[PDB]
Write a protein that holds these residues in place. Sequence first.
Motif, mmCIF file in Angstrom:
data_model
loop_
_atom_site.group_PDB
_atom_site.id
_atom_site.type_symbol
_atom_site.label_atom_id
_atom_site.label_comp_id
_atom_site.label_asym_id
_atom_site.label_seq_id
_atom_site.Cartn_x
_atom_site.Cartn_y
_atom_site.Cartn_z
ATOM 1 N N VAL A 42 -41.350 13.883 -47.758
ATOM 2 C CA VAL A 42 -41.785 14.184 -49.115
ATOM 3 C C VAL A 42 -40.559 14.360 -49.997
ATOM 4 O O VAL A 42 -39.583 15.005 -49.599
ATOM 5 N N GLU A 43 -40.610 13.777 -51.188
ATOM 6 C CA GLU A 43 -39.512 13.799 -52.143
ATOM 7 C C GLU A 43 -39.928 14.622 -53.353
ATOM 8 O O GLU A 43 -41.005 14.392 -53.927
ATOM 9 N N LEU A 44 -39.105 15.615 -53.691
ATOM 10 C CA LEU A 44 -39.261 16.398 -54.914
ATOM 11 C C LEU A 44 -38.251 15.939 -55.967
ATOM 12 O O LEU A 44 -37.318 16.650 -56.339
ATOM 13 N N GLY A 45 -38.450 14.725 -56.441
ATOM 14 C CA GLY A 45 -37.684 14.295 -57.591
ATOM 15 C C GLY A 45 -36.503 13.421 -57.209
ATOM 16 O O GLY A 45 -35.943 13.521 -56.109
ATOM 17 N N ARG A 46 -36.119 12.546 -58.135
ATOM 18 C CA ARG A 46 -35.019 11.613 -57.944
ATOM 19 C C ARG A 46 -34.127 11.649 -59.175
ATOM 20 O O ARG A 46 -34.605 11.880 -60.288
ATOM 21 N N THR A 47 -32.830 11.423 -58.972
ATOM 22 C CA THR A 47 -31.865 11.477 -60.065
ATOM 23 C C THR A 47 -31.025 10.210 -60.139
ATOM 24 O O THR A 47 -31.271 9.253 -59.399
ATOM 25 N N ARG A 48 -30.023 10.203 -61.020
ATOM 26 C CA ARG A 48 -29.167 9.032 -61.202
ATOM 27 C C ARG A 48 -27.868 9.476 -61.864
ATOM 28 O O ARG A 48 -27.878 9.861 -63.036
ATOM 29 N N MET A 49 -26.762 9.427 -61.121
ATOM 30 C CA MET A 49 -25.439 9.568 -61.715
ATOM 31 C C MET A 49 -24.428 8.893 -60.801
ATOM 32 O O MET A 49 -24.767 8.386 -59.729
ATOM 33 N N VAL A 108 -24.805 23.322 -59.651
ATOM 34 C CA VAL A 108 -26.221 22.990 -59.562
ATOM 35 C C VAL A 108 -26.467 21.690 -60.314
ATOM 36 O O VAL A 108 -25.722 21.325 -61.231
ATOM 37 N N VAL A 109 -27.513 20.979 -59.906
ATOM 38 C CA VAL A 109 -27.883 19.709 -60.518
ATOM 39 C C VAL A 109 -29.392 19.676 -60.702
ATOM 40 O O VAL A 109 -30.148 20.088 -59.816
ATOM 41 N N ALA A 110 -29.829 19.204 -61.864
ATOM 42 C CA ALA A 110 -31.244 19.060 -62.156
ATOM 43 C C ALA A 110 -31.739 17.681 -61.731
ATOM 44 O O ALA A 110 -30.961 16.756 -61.490
ATOM 45 N N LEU A 111 -33.057 17.549 -61.642
ATOM 46 C CA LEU A 111 -33.694 16.290 -61.294
ATOM 47 C C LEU A 111 -34.604 15.843 -62.427
ATOM 48 O O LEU A 111 -35.102 16.662 -63.200
ATOM 49 N N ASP A 112 -34.809 14.527 -62.523
ATOM 50 C CA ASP A 112 -35.692 13.995 -63.554
ATOM 51 C C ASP A 112 -37.137 14.433 -63.366
ATOM 52 O O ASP A 112 -37.923 14.367 -64.317
ATOM 53 N N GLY A 113 -37.508 14.862 -62.163
ATOM 54 C CA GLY A 113 -38.863 15.302 -61.902
ATOM 55 C C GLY A 113 -39.260 16.513 -62.719
ATOM 56 O O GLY A 113 -38.611 17.560 -62.647
ATOM 57 N N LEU A 154 -30.321 9.204 -55.421
ATOM 58 C CA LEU A 154 -30.369 10.304 -54.471
ATOM 59 C C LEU A 154 -31.698 11.032 -54.585
ATOM 60 O O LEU A 154 -32.336 11.037 -55.640
ATOM 61 N N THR A 155 -32.102 11.655 -53.481
ATOM 62 C CA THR A 155 -33.327 12.433 -53.406
ATOM 63 C C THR A 155 -33.042 13.768 -52.730
ATOM 64 O O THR A 155 -31.943 14.022 -52.229
ATOM 65 N N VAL A 156 -34.056 14.625 -52.726
ATOM 66 C CA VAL A 156 -34.037 15.889 -52.004
ATOM 67 C C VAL A 156 -35.294 15.947 -51.152
ATOM 68 O O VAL A 156 -36.382 15.591 -51.616
ATOM 69 N N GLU A 157 -35.148 16.378 -49.904
ATOM 70 C CA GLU A 157 -36.180 16.166 -48.899
ATOM 71 C C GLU A 157 -36.671 17.512 -48.380
ATOM 72 O O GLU A 157 -35.864 18.390 -48.079
ATOM 73 N N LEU A 158 -37.989 17.693 -48.273
ATOM 74 C CA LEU A 158 -38.508 18.993 -47.862
ATOM 75 C C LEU A 158 -39.385 18.962 -46.618
ATOM 76 O O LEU A 158 -39.803 20.028 -46.156
ATOM 77 N N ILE A 198 -28.311 11.129 -50.281
ATOM 78 C CA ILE A 198 -27.844 10.144 -51.250
ATOM 79 C C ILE A 198 -28.027 8.761 -50.644
ATOM 80 O O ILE A 198 -27.427 8.448 -49.609
ATOM 81 N N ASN A 199 -28.867 7.947 -51.283
ATOM 82 C CA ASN A 199 -29.059 6.545 -50.913
ATOM 83 C C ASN A 199 -29.356 6.386 -49.425
ATOM 84 O O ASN A 199 -28.846 5.482 -48.761
ATOM 85 N N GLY A 200 -30.191 7.273 -48.895
ATOM 86 C CA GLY A 200 -30.553 7.230 -47.495
ATOM 87 C C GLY A 200 -29.555 7.848 -46.543
ATOM 88 O O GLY A 200 -29.681 7.652 -45.329
ATOM 89 N N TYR A 201 -28.572 8.589 -47.047
ATOM 90 C CA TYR A 201 -27.548 9.189 -46.204
ATOM 91 C C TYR A 201 -27.427 10.661 -46.561
ATOM 92 O O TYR A 201 -27.214 11.001 -47.728
#
Lengths: 287, 44, 328, 83, 85, 79
Positions: free
Chosen positions: E15-22, E35-40, F9-13, F46-49
């Motif tokens: 499960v993904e809680l949001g995605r970003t881009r930098m 800290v970093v925010a997410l577009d979600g 990049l994503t965050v995974e729970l 980040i990008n699957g890593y």
Amino acid sequence: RPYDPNTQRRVVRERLQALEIINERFARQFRMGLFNLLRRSPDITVGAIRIQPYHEFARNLPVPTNLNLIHLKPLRGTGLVVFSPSLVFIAVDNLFGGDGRFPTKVEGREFTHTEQRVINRMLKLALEGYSDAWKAINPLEVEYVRSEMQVKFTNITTSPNDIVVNTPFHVEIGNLTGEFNICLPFSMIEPLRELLVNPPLENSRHEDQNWRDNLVRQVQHSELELVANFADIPLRLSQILKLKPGDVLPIEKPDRIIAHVDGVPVLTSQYGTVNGQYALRVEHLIN
Amino acid sequence: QLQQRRANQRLGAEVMSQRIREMSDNDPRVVALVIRQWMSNDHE
Amino acid sequence: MSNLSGTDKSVILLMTIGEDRAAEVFKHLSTREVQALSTAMANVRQISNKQLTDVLSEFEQEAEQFAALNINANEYLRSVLVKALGEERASSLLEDILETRDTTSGIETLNFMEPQSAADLIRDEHPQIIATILVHLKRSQAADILALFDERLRHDVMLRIATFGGVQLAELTEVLNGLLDGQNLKRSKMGGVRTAAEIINLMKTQQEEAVITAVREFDGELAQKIIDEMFLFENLVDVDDRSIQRLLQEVDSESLLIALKGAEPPLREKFLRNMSQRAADILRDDLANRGPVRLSQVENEQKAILLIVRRLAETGEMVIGSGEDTYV
Amino acid sequence: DLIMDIPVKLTVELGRTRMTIKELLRLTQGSVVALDGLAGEPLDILINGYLIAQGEVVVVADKYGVRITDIITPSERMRRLSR
Amino acid sequence: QDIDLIMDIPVKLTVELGRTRMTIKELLRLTQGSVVALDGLAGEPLDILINGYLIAQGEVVVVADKYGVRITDIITPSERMRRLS
Amino acid sequence: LIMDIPVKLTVELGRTRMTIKELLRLTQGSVVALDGLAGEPLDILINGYLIAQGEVVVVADKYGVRITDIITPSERMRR
């Protein structure tokens, strides 16, 4: 500011102007009905539409008060129309003859059967008002279910932290003033969220074909960027850092390439050369 | 002698039952008024 | 030839006329009339030949006076008026007349029974509806119901009446209908104050004293209310002398002599001043001559005297209305 | 350089064209379109939508590959994005 | 061709809680206290994927002091590409 | 040479290991538990890593991750 599952909010920041206009029209209908019934001209001030968890709404609700359940086909769930003691007090005073200069407190005594009957008389009027306010935007069949005394026995939502919408109304007759609210769980309006975000539209026939024609006639000529991705190779930051001119990076056999706009594929084709140019021999567009 | 007395009493009762039947067919509201008057006399 | 009440004659007519006949008879009869009728055959006796003959002859003689060949008033009037004035006008007039009859019947019925019943019936009601129900009733019954509420409720009702502003008739008729249905509540009150006081009066001295002590331990105020309702036998010390003399005109000399042996000397002194001088002297001489008497016999005579007082007070002759009130 | 090892998606682009909804709707089996890129002109090497370099397709002993020619060239990058 | 002849096959869902881009320059500066925010947006449905492939959307609840997702809707082709772009 | 390039990049729970019969039975409103403990530092990938570890905090009504630990590949093989 930490994150908790207790904040199970589909937080809303939109205007929800469709809800505001349907509320105003229902208020006007209720004003007409109340003027017809009580032989007096009231005024309804529609309070700001509120969004809050169910527990907060229950705590803000002045106990004791009248509560009533509605079922709204085809939406699954229940509405929680609440009548405060002040409004039924004013209604019974005006119906039975009085001036309201001698108000009485609420001592926790349950409503008399005559008071319950008057409540029902106002309730069917309010229900018809809500119905006729609804089918202008969406046909909803609203029907009374049962009456309740305390809020905690309603079980309107599965969890106390469930997000709900509360539409208040301040009804004034002369110097007499009262309030009553209509509470709807947010899940009742989830499928129609986009409908109630946008304001309602009046035209339904002329535009239906007028725009269906004019849009395809106008957007018929409008250029758009499209990019063909001929190859797809995976690398690593090591090779990117060491990437220097004069090397070869392997690529498999591309049998079909994808032309896409901003990423979304729009067609597939076979690459080739035509009249000294990198041409595409298209096959089909992805539907 | 008693048997004949009872027999003629029964016969008269039946014929007058026929007459009250045809009258109440003509108007049951008269019957209702008589009943109401009988309860009116009952409490006094 | 037992005397036959009107219910009996009506029953004799009813189970002879027919089934649909009885049904159409009740179609022109009140609901309480039908209930009273149905109460009869459930325990009625089998009719006799001469009894049925006499009741049906009485029906015939009333029939000679009762013969009009009438049609049902409501539907006939509706049929006439739907053409005379139209469907909507006929309906409006019919419902207006029906509501007027309903409110008149309700007002008349409510102006017929004992006050406290209606008082407790309307105690739980909202004060405003109490006000309009109270005004439209008879003034005598109005004051009778008025004299039974608490201070706050009654005062609020008077303020509302002094600031009345008119009342709609139709909802008032509906209110009378609602309270009429409220009256149709199959409940037995059997209040545990007056009945309890009478029961404690009926018991023997030791039993009633023990019960009074027990209830006073449980609640002194309730015991005081009970004794203020029942008064026991010794309350003759606080009874007016006129009532005592009226009682002596019926009590037996021997019974009074036996009872006075166990009576308190102050009570005897108060009592002996009420009859004639010769009677008082005879009673004193008898008390001096007569020896000790069994306490059971004295209690029985005292209970007989109490019962005599109760029956003579039921006729209203005796004034025992909660003490000697205020002298003026 | 603790971020030394991260996978990155590479991509090439051939060319683009000014071509509208009617022109794509008319496209059927065997239909042909053209791009800005000249025949044999270096394709453009990008990653996740950002230009990196230029390179041409080269066939060596029948395996395809991409041979690069230029670097990011930030001044030349500024020249390109100013279009 | 078969329908459910692959009755048992363990898979990994996430499960993904949001995605970003930098770019990398904005993560080389990320250390303790960064800290970093997410577009979600705070509260949209969590993105349920399997093997890194889109499956569904649904929020997250807590069950017996443990994370648990409440799936609501499955992904249609229309919003799949919208997520892609 | 590689100063700027946006990355994904994503965050995974949750990393539940489960087969497809517990997916075919899934319907609307179904709840499936995941091994991630509530409050355990969230893994930022980040990008699957996998890159970092740190829990979630909301800032300015936005999703945000409060990073605590970073790489040190010694805790990679057991994961």
